[PDB]
Amino acid sequence: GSGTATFGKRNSTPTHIRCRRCGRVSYNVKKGYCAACGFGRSRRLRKYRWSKKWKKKKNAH
Amino acid sequence: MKPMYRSRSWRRKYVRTPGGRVVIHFERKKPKIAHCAMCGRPLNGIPRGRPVEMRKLPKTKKRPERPMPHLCPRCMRKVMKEQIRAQL
Amino acid sequence: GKSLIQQRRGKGSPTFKSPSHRFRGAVKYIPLNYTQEKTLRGVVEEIMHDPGRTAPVARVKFENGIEKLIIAPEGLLVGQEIYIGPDAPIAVGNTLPLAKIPEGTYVYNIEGIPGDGGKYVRAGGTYALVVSREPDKVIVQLPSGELKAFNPMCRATIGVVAGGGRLEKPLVKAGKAYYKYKARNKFWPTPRGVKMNAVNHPFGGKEHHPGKPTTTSRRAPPGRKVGHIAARRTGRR
Amino acid sequence: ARNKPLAKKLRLAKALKQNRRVPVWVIVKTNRRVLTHPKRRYWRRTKLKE
RNA sequence: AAUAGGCGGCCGUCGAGGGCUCGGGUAGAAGACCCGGUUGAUAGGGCGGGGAUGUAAGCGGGAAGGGUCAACCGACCCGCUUAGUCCGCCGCCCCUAAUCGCCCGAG
RNA sequence: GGGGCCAAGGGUGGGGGUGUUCACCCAUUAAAGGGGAACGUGAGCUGGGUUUAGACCGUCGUGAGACAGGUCGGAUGCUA
RNA sequence: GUAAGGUCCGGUGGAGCCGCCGGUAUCGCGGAUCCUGCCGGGAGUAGCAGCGUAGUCGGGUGAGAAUCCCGACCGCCGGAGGGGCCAGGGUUCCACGGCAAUGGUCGUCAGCCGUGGGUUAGUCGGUCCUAACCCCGCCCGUAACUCGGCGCGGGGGAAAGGGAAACGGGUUUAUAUUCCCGUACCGCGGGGGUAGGUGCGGCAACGCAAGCCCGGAGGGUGACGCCUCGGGGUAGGCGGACCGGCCGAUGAGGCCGGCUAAGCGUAUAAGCCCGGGGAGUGCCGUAAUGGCGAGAACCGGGUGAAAGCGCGAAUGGCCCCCCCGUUAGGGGGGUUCCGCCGAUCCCUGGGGCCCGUGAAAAGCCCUCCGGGAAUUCCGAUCCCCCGCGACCGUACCGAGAACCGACACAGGUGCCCCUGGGUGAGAAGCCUAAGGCGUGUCGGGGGAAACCCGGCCGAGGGAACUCGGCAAACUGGCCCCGUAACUUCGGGAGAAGGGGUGCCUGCGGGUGCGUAACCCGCAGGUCGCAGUGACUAGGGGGGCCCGACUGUUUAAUAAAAACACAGGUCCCAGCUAGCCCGAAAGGGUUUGUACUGGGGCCGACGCCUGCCCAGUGCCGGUAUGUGAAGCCCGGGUACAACCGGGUGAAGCACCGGUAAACGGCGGGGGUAACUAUAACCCUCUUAAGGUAGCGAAAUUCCUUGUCGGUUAAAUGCCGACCUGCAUGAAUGGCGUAACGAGGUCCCCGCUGUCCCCGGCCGGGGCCCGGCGAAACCUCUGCCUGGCGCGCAUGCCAGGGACC
RNA sequence: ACCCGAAACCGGUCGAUCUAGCCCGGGGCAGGGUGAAGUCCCUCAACCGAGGGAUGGAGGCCCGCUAGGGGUGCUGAUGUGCAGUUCGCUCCCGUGACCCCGGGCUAGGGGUGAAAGGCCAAUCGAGGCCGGAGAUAGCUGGUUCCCGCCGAAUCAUCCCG
RNA sequence: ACCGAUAGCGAACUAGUACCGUGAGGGAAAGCUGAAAAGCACCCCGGGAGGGGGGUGAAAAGAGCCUGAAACCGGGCGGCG
RNA sequence: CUCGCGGGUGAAGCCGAAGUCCGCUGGAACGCGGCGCCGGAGAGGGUGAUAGCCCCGUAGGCGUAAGCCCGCAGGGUCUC
RNA sequence: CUAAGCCGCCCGGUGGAUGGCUCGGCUCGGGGCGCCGACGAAGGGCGUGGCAAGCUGCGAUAAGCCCCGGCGAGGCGCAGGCAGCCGUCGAACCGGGGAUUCCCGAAUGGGACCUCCCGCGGCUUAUGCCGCACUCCGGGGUUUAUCCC
Ligand SMILES: [Zn+2]
Numbered sequence A: 001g002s003g004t005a006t007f008g009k010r011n012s013t014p015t016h017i018r019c020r021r022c023g024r025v026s027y028n029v030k031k032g033y034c035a036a037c038g039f040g041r042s043r044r045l046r047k048y049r050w051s052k053k054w055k056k057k058k059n060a061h
Numbered sequence B: 001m002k003p004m005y006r007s008r009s010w011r012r013k014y015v016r017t018p019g020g021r022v023v024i025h026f027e028r029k030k031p032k033i034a035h036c037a038m039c040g041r042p043l044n045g046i047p048r049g050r051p052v053e054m055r056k057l058p059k060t061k062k063r064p065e066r067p068m069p070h071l072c073p074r075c076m077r078k079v080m081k082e083q084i085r086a087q088l
Numbered sequence C: 001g002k003s004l005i006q007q008r009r010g011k012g013s014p015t016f017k018s019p020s021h022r023f024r025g026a027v028k029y030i031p032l033n034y035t036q037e038k039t040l041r042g043v044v045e046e047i048m049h050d051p052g053r054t055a056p057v058a059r060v061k062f063e064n065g066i067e068k069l070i071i072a073p074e075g076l077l078v079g080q081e082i083y084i085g086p087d088a089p090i091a092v093g094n095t096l097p098l099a100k101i102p103e104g105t106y107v108y109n110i111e112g113i114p115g116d117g118g119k120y121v122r123a124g125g126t127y128a129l130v131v132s133r134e135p136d137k138v139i140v141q142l143p144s145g146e147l148k149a150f151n152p153m154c155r156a157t158i159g160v161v162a163g164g165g166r167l168e169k170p171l172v173k174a175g176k177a178y179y180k181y182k183a184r185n186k187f188w189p190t191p192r193g194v195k196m197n198a199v200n201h202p203f204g205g206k207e208h209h210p211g212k213p214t215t216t217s218r219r220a221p222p223g224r225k226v227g228h229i230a231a232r233r234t235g236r237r
Numbered sequence D: 001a002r003n004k005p006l007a008k009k010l011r012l013a014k015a016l017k018q019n020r021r022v023p024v025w026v027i028v029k030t031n032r033r034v035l036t037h038p039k040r041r042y043w044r045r046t047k048l049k050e
Numbered sequence E: 001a002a003u004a005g006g007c008g009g010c011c012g013u014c015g016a017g018g019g020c021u022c023g024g025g026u027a028g029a030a031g032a033c034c035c036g037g038u039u040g041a042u043a044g045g046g047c048g049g050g051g052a053u054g055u056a057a058g059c060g061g062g063a064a065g066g067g068u069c070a071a072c073c074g075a076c077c078c079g080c081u082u083a084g085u086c087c088g089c090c091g092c093c094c095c096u097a098a099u100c101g102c103c104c105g106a107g
Numbered sequence F: 001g002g003g004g005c006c007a008a009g010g011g012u013g014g015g016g017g018u019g020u021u022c023a024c025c026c027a028u029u030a031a032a033g034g035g036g037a038a039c040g041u042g043a044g045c046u047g048g049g050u051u052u053a054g055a056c057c058g059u060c061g062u063g064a065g066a067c068a069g070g071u072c073g074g075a076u077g078c079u080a
Numbered sequence G: 001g002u003a004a005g006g007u008c009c010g011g012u013g014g015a016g017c018c019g020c021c022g023g024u025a026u027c028g029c030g031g032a033u034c035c036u037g038c039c040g041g042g043a044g045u046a047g048c049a050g051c052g053u054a055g056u057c058g059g060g061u062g063a064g065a066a067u068c069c070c071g072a073c074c075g076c077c078g079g080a081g082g083g084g085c086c087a088g089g090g091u092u093c094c095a096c097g098g099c100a101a102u103g104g105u106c107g108u109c110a111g112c113c114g115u116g117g118g119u120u121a122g123u124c125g126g127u128c129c130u131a132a133c134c135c136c137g138c139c140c141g142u143a144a145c146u147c148g149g150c151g152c153g154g155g156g157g158a159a160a161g162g163g164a165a166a167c168g169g170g171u172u173u174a175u176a177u178u179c180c181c182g183u184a185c186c187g188c189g190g191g192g193g194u195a196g197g198u199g200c201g202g203c204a205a206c207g208c209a210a211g212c213c214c215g216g217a218g219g220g221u222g223a224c225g226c227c228u229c230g231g232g233g234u235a236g237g238c239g240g241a242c243c244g245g246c247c248g249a250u251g252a253g254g255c256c257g258g259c260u261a262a263g264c265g266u267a268u269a270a271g272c273c274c275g276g277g278g279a280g281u282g283c284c285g286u287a288a289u290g291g292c293g294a295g296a297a298c299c300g301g302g303u304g305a306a307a308g309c310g311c312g313a314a315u316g317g318c319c320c321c322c323c324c325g326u327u328a329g330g331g332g333g334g335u336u337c338c339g340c341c342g343a344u345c346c347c348u349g350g351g352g353c354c355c356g357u358g359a360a361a362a363g364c365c366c367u368c369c370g371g372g373a374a375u376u377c378c379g380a381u382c383c384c385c386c387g388c389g390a391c392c393g394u395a396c397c398g399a400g401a402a403c404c405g406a407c408a409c410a411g412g413u414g415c416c417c418c419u420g421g422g423u424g425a426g427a428a429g430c431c432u433a434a435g436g437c438g439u440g441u442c443g444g445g446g447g448a449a450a451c452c453c454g455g456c457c458g459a460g461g462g463a464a465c466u467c468g469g470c471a472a473a474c475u476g477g478c479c480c481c482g483u484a485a486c487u488u489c490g491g492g493a494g495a496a497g498g499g500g501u502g503c504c505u506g507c508g509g510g511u512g513c514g515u516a517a518c519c520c521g522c523a524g525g526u527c528g529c530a531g532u533g534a535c536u537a538g539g540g541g542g543g544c545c546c547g548a549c550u551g552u553u554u555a556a557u558a559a560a561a562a563c564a565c566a567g568g569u570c571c572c573a574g575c576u577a578g579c580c581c582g583a584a585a586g587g588g589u590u591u592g593u594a595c596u597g598g599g600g601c602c603g604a605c606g607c608c609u610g611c612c613c614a615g616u617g618c619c620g621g622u623a624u625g626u627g628a629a630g631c632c633c634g635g636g637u638a639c640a641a642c643c644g645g646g647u648g649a650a651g652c653a654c655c656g657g658u659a660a661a662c663g664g665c666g667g668g669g670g671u672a673a674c675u676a677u678a679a680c681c682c683u684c685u686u687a688a689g690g691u692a693g694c695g696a697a698a699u700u701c702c703u704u705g706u707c708g709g710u711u712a713a714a715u716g717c718c719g720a721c722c723u724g725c726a727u728g729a730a731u732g733g734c735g736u737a738a739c740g741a742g743g744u745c746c747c748c749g750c751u752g753u754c755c756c757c758g759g760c761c762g763g764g765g766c767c768c769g770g771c772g773a774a775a776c777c778u779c780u781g782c783c784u785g786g787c788g789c790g791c792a793u794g795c796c797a798g799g800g801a802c803c
Numbered sequence H: 001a002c003c004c005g006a007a008a009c010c011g012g013u014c015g016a017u018c019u020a021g022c023c024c025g026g027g028g029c030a031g032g033g034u035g036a037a038g039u040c041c042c043u044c045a046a047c048c049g050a051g052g053g054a055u056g057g058a059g060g061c062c063c064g065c066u067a068g069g070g071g072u073g074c075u076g077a078u079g080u081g082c083a084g085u086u087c088g089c090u091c092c093c094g095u096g097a098c099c100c101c102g103g104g105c106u107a108g109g110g111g112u113g114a115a116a117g118g119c120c121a122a123u124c125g126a127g128g129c130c131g132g133a134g135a136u137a138g139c140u141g142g143u144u145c146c147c148g149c150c151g152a153a154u155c156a157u158c159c160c161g
Numbered sequence I: 001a002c003c004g005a006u007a008g009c010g011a012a013c014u015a016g017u018a019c020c021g022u023g024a025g026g027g028a029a030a031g032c033u034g035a036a037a038a039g040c041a042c043c044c045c046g047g048g049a050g051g052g053g054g055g056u057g058a059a060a061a062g063a064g065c066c067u068g069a070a071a072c073c074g075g076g077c078g079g080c081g
Numbered sequence J: 001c002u003c004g005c006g007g008g009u010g011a012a013g014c015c016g017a018a019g020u021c022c023g024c025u026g027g028a029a030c031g032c033g034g035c036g037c038c039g040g041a042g043a044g045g046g047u048g049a050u051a052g053c054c055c056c057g058u059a060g061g062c063g064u065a066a067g068c069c070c071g072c073a074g075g076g077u078c079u080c
Numbered sequence K: 001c002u003a004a005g006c007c008g009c010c011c012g013g014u015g016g017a018u019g020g021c022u023c024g025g026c027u028c029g030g031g032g033c034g035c036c037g038a039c040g041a042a043g044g045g046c047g048u049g050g051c052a053a054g055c056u057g058c059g060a061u062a063a064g065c066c067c068c069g070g071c072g073a074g075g076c077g078c079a080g081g082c083a084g085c086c087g088u089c090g091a092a093c094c095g096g097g098g099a100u101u102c103c104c105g106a107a108u109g110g111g112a113c114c115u116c117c118c119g120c121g122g123c124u125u126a127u128g129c130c131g132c133a134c135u136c137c138g139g140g141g142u143u144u145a146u147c148c149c
């Protein structure tokens, strides 16, 4: 096991769905928060200075 | 069948239609008969039915015409006797 | 190293949490304001089996309209009347302050302090013996054999807890043990530190023996108190 | 799949409308410069973002 | 066999000889090899010989018994029956196909 | 029979315990020779021993653990 | 020009470029198992087999047909390759028009390309309720927070839990419980009547239309585990009669059709009741358990399911026949009974089990309390009629091509729910009906080999093969006789071993009204080598080691003697406890309370578990010594720093308990010489010197110990001795029935394991037509003796060699 | 600091669709055998008792290609595979400590573990992603035009050398 | 006194795009006809794709478009064979 | 402070000199040879080749609503 | 007039180096300009063109609507096409001022396993409009609920 036969069990509920705030498919549906912008867990955006994705969004790196 | 019908809370019956087709009819199970509040034995004069069937009937066709229809006759007579004796 | 089972239990994970939603509810006395200076009469409605209690439970309806759950004493009968208060008669199933209970009586469900709801002698088949009565304290012999002093106003129930002799019959089967421990979510089956790895237990190692004496000090830090903790002695005497 | 929320259905509708070829008159106007767009999709090979 | 041989015959300074194609194996992984090709029994077909199984279908009779002790049913047995079926073996008979055609080739 | 010379064309086999090479033993035999070929030969095979990861016993070590000490299990890739 | 390079000539090219002086720089490439791009040999080669080997003939279309279409034949699946439908996919669905690319070959075909379309709901699902659980506010902690948290208030949380209401026929290329027709139901509101407000029948169980509006309470229902059995019913199946059609010989016979939804009305069974009645040297009843003066037989009744029956409904569907048939159409017939089996599908009752107790709330029904309106009036849960009923999903696949795994992937998700006939105990195997397919998609040829994979057979011997009977082979179902050691008395056990088995003819028996259905015997006749004839379908026995057993484990080299287990025993803890998480706040055990919670070790069961507290741990005491800061006293400092002394907790020193706490349990001489050799015995020595058991052991180095059995032969196996290098009693000792894909030895039987290999079948290999790679590659590539970094295709001397 | 290469350490975040554990709600397991408790019946005797016949359905019971689950041997096929763990034969469990599904919780010196250092998304003796970071090495590899002149050393002392 | 499309920001262009991972996050390749489309009318062949003539242009620079190097492949010629 | 007045500044923007003369090559002159001109303009770009005078522009000037700033005049408050 | 094969030149194919070009990058002394949002921000989702897929721009008034001013004859984005339409009553374009501005989003009346749903009070005939999150500050009222404004 642990390989090809394991990958066949991905027909359940997806871990992440689209987020209403940031528009990315990163909303943890079971827990109820976004892994990208923190929607549903914080009023402020999830920004980390070790991360370059939000800079990539606006070509500011 | 649908996963909702795969549950055993539904009653499944195979029925032949007038046009010659075979279809499955699904129904919900009936509630159990009412029981006495004091001894737990079955009551009389109270038909079994789902809420729609119960609402399909008039008032007097759902309980017997005697005091305390929630008790079996033995418990009802006993309670009446205790009340009468306690009053005196 | 890695954590121990006792260390992991303190974090409250569902592996160790008690499933306190399939049980019948906590068994506590009625508030002390009702019982003080007044005697209440109740009727036993039903006797049921609490999934995790080791003792049967009973439902009591009082004349004031309060419905309560009590630990059923041995011989308690459905439909019988019971009394709680200073003036209650001395009979099985009646709750009285410890000052009004005659010496030599068997009691259970004793409040540690007046009005706490009952803390002692609650397991099935257990009873305590009233030894002496004094204006300042009442001495009772507990199931463990200790003589303990209680306030005279502490409440207790006369009788013996039902369900005794439960250990007379062996469990026989690992399946029986599995069901018994799954009913209350107790860690089962249990492993052995000697067969654990060195990273996991103080006794762990390739050779299945403890490398140090198994009597551990009372002052040992958490993650070290295994084996015989602060043992006065060991072996068979 | 049988039961779908309206918002997800609308997003799938937008993707379906996006998936089409470049107009021939657009190709003629651009003089064989604009031949395709990066939103072309094959339902069995390249999957949707959602 | 680099001393890369000998002899008989046919051919050249249009042409001896050969290949593909054809019917078959004394042969075979492709190539190659061997017999036959109307100067004909090579294969098929017909007939006959020899062999292998084991007595065909159909009909007549019998059959332990049953059946209104009648009609009729009946596993199985006997006679026509060394039968029937089959032959990657042989012999005889040109009835059928071995035809037509294409190519190389020293000077 | 014992010792030696020429002579390498041919032969020099089958079985019991043991992973064994070897050594020992059995019944035959003319005899049942010793060696080299990357201790010939795993892009020919087998995988019993040895030499990982699991586990047991004995001894040693406070311990983690170790033993050219035993013991059970433990993968053999190929279109020239 | 030594050279790094420079410059001319001929050609291509169409717009910039150079000499010298002085500055400046991402300034010069063959390597970095360098980076990016492109292209070679391998190669027109491998692969397009294995687990389901499927096509052929005639016709059609088209430029083009093994591959597309129709008919026939022949096949495969048939408890799934058939039917339905989730999650996931998101247009893959339908029609028309096409083959540049995709499809393992071709293609006129397509899940491909292009152009147009397609998803219709008061009743199906979401929407409502709550479960495990989650979020927000206050509060507390944190330097702080988007971080942690108890308690209060609020909210969310199931497309398989609870939960108002629709079912036939028809219609489209593609939607239909949604559109059309027919017949219904539910919720809200309204109109007209009526029951009731102010009404009756029964001893009773109860039968009844049995007043309206607001608020509250109670009861019931919603509402529940596992095992097992009886009763009732329905789908489905079988046999017979009859009417149409087909086949068959217009014989016998076989096959096909002979159909009936919701809704409305209607009642019995079990269970439970209600009146009468008054038993025992006892009656009554069940499959079974069982019931009776705490009220049985027995006679009456009440309430109470799934179903059946009537309307719906024969103008509908099905089958057949006739006239018109150039296209297009129009009519006439029937659709009826009996018997048997019978569910895993529904209803309903018993019984048994738990150291296991197998959800909540919304909703609905009834009853009871208070309050309000009503008399030329109020007014229904009853009858008739009318109006309204929102938002979102609805196509399609649902998998050996529509999902995930990079793929038209032999895996996984979903085999998640369902199954005609025969044989048969069987949802087994085999054949077959319906339904589906020839797309688990490259075809053609062939004594066309060798060799490989899968299968069948093999004379004589029967393990001589091998580490090892690996693999294969023997046995096999059912009926009847018969069955050992040992044992925990349950088992071992289907031990072992022996006999029978087909077909036909005819009787007897059980239950049954039955000559319906199922099952069990008897007698006779007869055929073959073989009668569980195919299919299905144990080989068996005796010792030893380990683990009691069922179970679990290293997903991807170890399934075990390893882990777990019930049982034994030890330790801590009376609750603001013991143990544990955390920075804190708070928290887990805990809706708990010693028959409990937590922490070790051994490990079923039977008999037992000896000695040692000197050491290392743990526990209790601590008179006495030491023992930090603080405090006090003296000196010093115009104040301090600094120095000396006293007080001095815990901890060590010291003392005592404790080994089912960690561990340990020795060593020399001589004897009792009724020979020789053993311990009775006397000397150092420690805390003590290994007791009961077992022993060449999974522990033994010498070792293949010695003796006995097993063989012709025994580094094996079993039994015994004890010299135990280096066994031993809960890191347990010994023994042990049953159990085991564990290791090990032997015996009968069996066989191609072997002597010794030989035939046959299917698929590859081989050839032909197509698609068409990769691993790898310094350039190359013959040998003998040598030199050499010490084993050279390439160097030296020789030998040989056409491509 | 001429250029490239480490295993590793540290911070903040992301993951329980694989798999491990536990909680709430659900679906499933043809057919056959054996025969525990319990409830009895009959005959001969009667001071003891002996013999025979039933019913009953329990089990971490038995056989079993039912479905489903597992993975012993062939060390079989395949091993640039159908497949980055599959296929065939053989074998084991198959009413229970059973198998599977939807909703939840436990997150990295942490979880979970019938304890194999196993499992935590093809990764586990400390996961993944980005950041510290171009980390460091006395160790390995590489370092690009030509001519002209001169032209070595591997020996002494000291360094965890 | 910077680079001149493997350089310069990752992106000279429908670039933080396509695409990979459940997720944090990771992240390309891709510029040029001609002065003017004057972008080849008509004929023969082919099912088509295209081929041959004939035209436009100073030049096919022919859209598979400025120059077209090297590696590699096919043919012709010279030399060996 | 502005019922009022004046000025400055302040958008899009406007003006802004001089060959497109003859011959040659050329598909096309920005090239070559000859003859001229402007220049506070010979920076740069486009235009069918490399252009001071073909065009944009440049050297030098002009205009601009709202808004902003300063001042005049008038009306007030406060400080010493 | 040797078959394969080998080297060199020429022609052709494959490929895309070199050269020339540049509306793009990079770096700078100096100068300018520097916050938006409950009067609902930034970031997103979805729509919007006659033929319209991507980018860009806009928002159901949707490559756009209105008004003063500048320019002065063409215009309808990147983007070379078909057919049309707009402009002399001054467009396109440009500076300034207005109108429209769906849904999610601090998201705010209450909820989100899907950027979509479900309410309560006033006015309004109806269409329709406004108000209703939490933690506070300055005030009023009462029911004294921290309830309403
Ligand atoms: Zn987000």
Ligand SMILES: [Zn+2]
Pocket: B036, B037, B038, B039, B040, B041, B071, B072, B073, B074, B075, B076
């Ligand atoms: Zn009652």
